[PDB]
Design a protein around this motif. Structure first.
Motif, short mmCIF file in Angstrom:
data_model
loop_
_atom_site.label_atom_id
_atom_site.label_comp_id
_atom_site.label_asym_id
_atom_site.label_seq_id
_atom_site.Cartn_x
_atom_site.Cartn_y
_atom_site.Cartn_z
N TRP A 89 0.75 -1.15 -0.02
CA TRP A 89 -0.04 -0.06 -0.10
C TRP A 89 0.97 1.24 0.00
O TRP A 89 1.86 1.19 0.70
CB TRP A 89 -0.79 -0.01 1.10
CG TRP A 89 -2.18 -1.14 1.25
CD1 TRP A 89 -1.78 -2.26 2.02
CD2 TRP A 89 -3.28 -1.15 0.73
NE1 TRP A 89 -3.14 -2.89 1.72
CE2 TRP A 89 -4.02 -2.21 0.98
CE3 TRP A 89 -3.94 -0.09 -0.15
CZ2 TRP A 89 -5.14 -2.57 0.65
CZ3 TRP A 89 -5.15 -0.44 -0.51
CH2 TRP A 89 -5.88 -1.66 -0.23
N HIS A 91 0.62 4.04 1.42
CA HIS A 91 0.70 4.70 2.63
C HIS A 91 0.77 3.66 3.88
O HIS A 91 -0.10 3.53 4.84
CB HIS A 91 -0.52 5.71 3.18
CG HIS A 91 -0.75 6.58 2.15
ND1 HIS A 91 -1.93 6.83 1.35
CD2 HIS A 91 0.06 7.65 1.79
CE1 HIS A 91 -1.47 7.83 0.41
NE2 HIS A 91 -0.50 8.47 0.56
N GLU A 92 1.89 2.77 3.80
CA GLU A 92 2.46 2.10 4.87
C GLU A 92 3.88 2.16 4.74
O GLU A 92 4.55 2.41 3.62
CB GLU A 92 1.81 0.58 4.93
CG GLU A 92 2.56 -0.46 3.75
CD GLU A 92 2.05 -1.66 3.66
OE1 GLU A 92 1.31 -2.32 4.79
OE2 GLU A 92 1.90 -2.26 2.43
N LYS A 93 4.44 1.79 5.88
CA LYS A 93 5.95 2.03 6.11
C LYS A 93 6.73 1.81 4.97
O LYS A 93 7.60 2.70 4.66
CB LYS A 93 6.35 1.69 7.59
CG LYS A 93 7.80 1.81 7.95
CD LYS A 93 7.99 0.48 8.81
N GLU A 239 15.40 9.81 6.79
CA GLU A 239 14.66 10.16 8.15
C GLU A 239 15.17 9.42 9.31
O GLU A 239 15.35 10.06 10.34
CB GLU A 239 13.25 10.19 7.98
CG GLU A 239 12.59 10.38 6.45
CD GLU A 239 11.30 10.39 6.57
OE1 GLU A 239 10.60 10.56 7.67
OE2 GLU A 239 10.63 10.39 5.44
N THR A 240 15.48 8.12 9.21
CA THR A 240 15.70 7.42 10.46
C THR A 240 17.14 6.71 10.30
O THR A 240 17.86 6.26 11.49
CB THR A 240 14.57 6.26 10.43
OG1 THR A 240 15.24 5.10 9.79
CG2 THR A 240 13.50 6.46 10.20
N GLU A 242 18.20 3.93 9.00
CA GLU A 242 18.22 2.47 8.85
C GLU A 242 17.86 1.62 7.57
O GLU A 242 17.19 2.45 6.78
CB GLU A 242 17.08 1.91 9.88
CG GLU A 242 17.84 0.99 11.10
CD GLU A 242 16.80 0.43 12.04
OE1 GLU A 242 15.79 0.91 12.58
OE2 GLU A 242 16.81 -0.90 11.84
N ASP A 246 14.98 -7.45 7.17
CA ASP A 246 15.34 -8.58 6.40
C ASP A 246 14.16 -9.29 6.16
O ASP A 246 14.28 -9.87 5.10
CB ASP A 246 16.24 -9.14 7.60
CG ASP A 246 17.50 -8.92 7.94
OD1 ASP A 246 18.62 -8.98 7.04
OD2 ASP A 246 17.90 -8.57 9.12
N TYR A 329 -8.43 3.10 -5.87
CA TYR A 329 -9.54 3.47 -4.97
C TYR A 329 -9.78 4.75 -4.80
O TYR A 329 -8.61 5.68 -4.96
CB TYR A 329 -9.49 2.80 -3.39
CG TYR A 329 -8.42 3.61 -2.46
CD1 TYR A 329 -7.04 3.23 -2.77
CD2 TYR A 329 -8.84 4.50 -1.90
CE1 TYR A 329 -6.11 4.06 -2.02
CE2 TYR A 329 -7.86 5.01 -1.12
CZ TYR A 329 -6.22 4.52 -1.15
OH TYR A 329 -5.44 5.24 -0.30
#
Ligand code: FDE
Ligand code: FDE
Lengths: 450, 452
Positions: A89, A91-93, A239-240, A242, A246, A329
């Protein structure tokens, strides 16, 4: 603001019986030819609207109003691809994270790195066909997936599937077909919890372990290179700070093995079908290949110059787009085309082979194979030609495919003459993608050395 | 001096939330604490909290007159299935103090002597599993530890046998529980909670609630057949302060709470304890010296477990480095100033970052990252509030006596009956649900061929 057309209903089963074929996409095209630019399609629990005209699809491609949707097909494929780029999706991480980490691997300069490795496997294909005895023939879809799977493996992961060292289909691909075949058959199961499907469900897991076991072999062969797999392991999220988890990295490898070889494999097979059925078009591209590929192996620049081969490629994927549909959608409540209201969350499906046969855009010969429509790439108005999806969720491997298909198609034209010795009747097998089934040809070597 | 508080980068109306969009948030906060120091503010849309890492301020937060246990947004999400249980209760709630007084008898010393037999039951099952492996096979430690600890809470708490060692894949309760705990943690990082991407998550969450309740319905009904265990006190006991027994809704919450909290952190604890030993063979060899010395019977007695003191020090040095329940939250009873530098209004919340508190150089010396069990040879030498793996105050861990006895027994028999090889040179990878566990830790076990 009028009412929407709808095909035959079967009591409480709605429209589900109408796709009770092994060819659902072609059944939808018939319904599209019977009902027009938009129709409603209901299943036990789901409802979707199929769009066929550029008029409505042009507003659907507006990212301010519509976002990529996971069709019931993609939700089933998510059972083995997870949150990788294709089945994620927006808008998922992990979509944003991985999209920005993998995008350098598809830049134009990264392509220059891939070229030597793409040339490796393409030479293997030429050498396979050059060593056929006079009586033998070629299975087009089988040798193309041998080639396309090997390319995505070598360039992406420095892993050699050695598909040309296997008379049989490669085991990864054979269970992948069964997993993709299972996913499509679940769209036609009214009650998926019937005990009758217990063998089907257990085979499904057996095939996923086969896909994951290969991925762990790819991972074990590393942990010396700057390929796509290095970028998955090393890229930082700005931003993070990382890298990718895995579990996601296993998910992206699956995604690229699947989406990165099957749609290219169907593509090349369709291009060869249309050439071998249109013999004047075949000699014009054969003239360009003989002109441009002046070296024993092609250079990167030479591929960029195979303009007419590229038009052959664009006209084939227009007629038969190897990924046949993408879903959307409704971010917010809206009215479509000024006639069709949609509440927030209502779903649309772009029927890509139907968009590309829209008489109002391409003229009244939409069904004919004429590569000369793409001699002017700029002529075709926006959102009329959408074989690679839309917007930020469009195909990330959009240039990798074109370069691979062009290079491979170019060398086949340079090295062989092709006879459609059986008068092949086009039969389009549907996994979730499209490919010609039992398509065969004969190749006389022009005896040009490598 | 009153001073402004550190806070890492902000991302607009999303505040600090993008910084924790990872699979391992606690180790990410340990990175932020390492760079901003002993305390920092962390903002999300609806919430704000300040993270503490140094002993000087955390000893101040452990003052029960000023601070009381707070339900962090993580505990509020677990409350969706943990409800009114001991763990997700406010101290001022009727059902906290009530249930506390009813169940505390079950974790007494007198109760401990009764459990010892049942713990040995489970532990012998584990030993026999490892002795019956063929030569080429290996052991996945956290999966076999959850098999052990879960069977232990089931038998000792509810007289219920999960038979986890008679199963190949995890028990279905274990899969639904972790997926529920995973959901709770992931809802914390989520910007737009109504996005279509999360419909499967809401569905699957509800699917996972029904399975955990169904299993509790099986435990409760299986007793109406049939003891003096923890469940008997839940059903038959009455609160000594008010004379009310527990609500039937509440008893369902207490069984869930103890199934979760009463096995998850002990299984991670043992997994880390086994990890540090295969990494420090001088420490490992010394611990098997003591287990071979003390455990002279085929099975250990209660007195023998209490005589394994170096094994206990191994466990304490393990849980300092990786506290498997990594944080607990507090709020301010009234307006107060922390450290004379940070003013706090009434109701503001704090979070104790236990792995960072246990990495304070001012208390433990300049080798806090070294695994040295001998820091716990001198029980008094530790400053107060420097070691907080079991919470604080009246809301401290009710089962830390229970955990220690379970972990020491199992760790003791493993040392007596096996030699352990780190055949993969395993690299430590710490999976985070809301608790901590090593993820892919595998080892090989040579039987010392000692009978039972
Ligand atoms: C590697 C590779 C290769 C390729 C190829 C191809 C061909 C030949 C064709 C194609 C296509 C496509 N894609 Fe493709 N491809 C790829 C890929 C991909 C990915 C990853 C994706 C997703 C993206 C994102 O989202 O991020 C795609 C994508 C794609 C699309 C869209 C999807 C949706 O659902 O929307 C389409 C239509 N693709 N494709
Ligand atoms: C049975 C059991 C066992 C155990 C164990 C353990 C280990 C190893 C570790 C631990 C921990 C802990 N806990 Fe623990 N545990 C338990 C439990 C519990 C409970 C019930 C609780 C709550 C208490 C009150 O509050 O009341 C706890 C508790 C606890 C805590 C705190 C929480 C807060 O929030 O504060 C901590 C930190 N635990 N833990």
């Amino acid at each position: 603001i009028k009412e929407m057309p709808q095909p035959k209903t079967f009591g409480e089963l709605k429209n589900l019986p109408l796709l009770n074929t092994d060819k659902p996409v072609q059944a939808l095209m018939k319904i599209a030819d019977e009902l027009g630019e938009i129709f409603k399609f209901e299943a036990p629990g789901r409802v979707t609207r199929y769009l066929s005209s550029q008029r409505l699809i042009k507003e659907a491609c507006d990212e301010s109003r519509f976002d990529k949707n996971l069709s019931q097909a993609l939700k089933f494929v998510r059972d083995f691809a997870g949150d990788g780029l294709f089945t994620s999706w927006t808008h998922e991480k992990n979509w944003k994270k991985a999209h920005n980490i993998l995008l350098p691997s598809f830049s134009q300069q990264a392509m220059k790195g891939y070229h030597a490795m793409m040339v490796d496997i393409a030479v293997q294909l030429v050498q396979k066909w050059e060593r056929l005895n006079a009586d033998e023939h070629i299975e087009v879809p089988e040798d193309m997936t041998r080639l396309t799977l090997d390319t995505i493996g070598l360039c992406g992961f420095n892993y050699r599937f050695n598909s040309f060292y296997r008379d049989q289909p490669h085991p990864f691909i054979t269970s992948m077909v069964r997993a993709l075949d299972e996913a499509m058959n679940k769209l036609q199961r009214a009650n998926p919890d019937d005990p009758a499907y217990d063998e089907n469900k257990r085979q499904f897991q057996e095939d996923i372990k086969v896909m994951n076991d290969l991925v762990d072999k790819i991972i074990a062969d590393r942990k010396q290179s700057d390929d796509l797999l290095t970028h998955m392991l090393n890229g930082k999220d700005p931003e993070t700070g990382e890298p990718l988890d895995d579990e996601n990295i296993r998910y992206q490898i699956i995604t690229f093995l699947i989406a990165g070889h099957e749609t290219v494999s169907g593509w090349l097979s369709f291009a060869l079908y249309f050439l071998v059925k249109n013999p004047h078009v075949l000699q014009k591209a054969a003239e360009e290949a003989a002109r441009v590929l002046v070296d024993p192996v092609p250079s990167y620049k030479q591929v960029k110059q195979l303009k007419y081969v590229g038009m052959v490629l664009n006209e084939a994927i227009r007629l038969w787009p190897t990924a046949p549909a993408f879903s959307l959608y409704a971010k917010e409540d809206t009215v479509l085309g000024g006639e069709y209201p949609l509440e927030k969350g209502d779903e649309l499906m772009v029927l890509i082979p139907q968009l590309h046969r829209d008489k109002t855009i391409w003229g009244d010969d939409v069904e004919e194979f004429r590569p000369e429509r793409f001699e002017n790439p700029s002529a075709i108005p926006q959102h009329a030609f959408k074989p690679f999806g839309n917007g930020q969720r469009a195909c990330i491997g959009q240039q990798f495919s074109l370069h691979e298909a062009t290079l491979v198609l170019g060398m086949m034209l340079k090295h062989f003459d092709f006879e459609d010795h059986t008068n092949y009747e086009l039969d389009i097998k549907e996994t979730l993608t499209l490919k010609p089934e039992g398509f065969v040809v004969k190749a006389k070597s022009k005896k040009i050395p490598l």
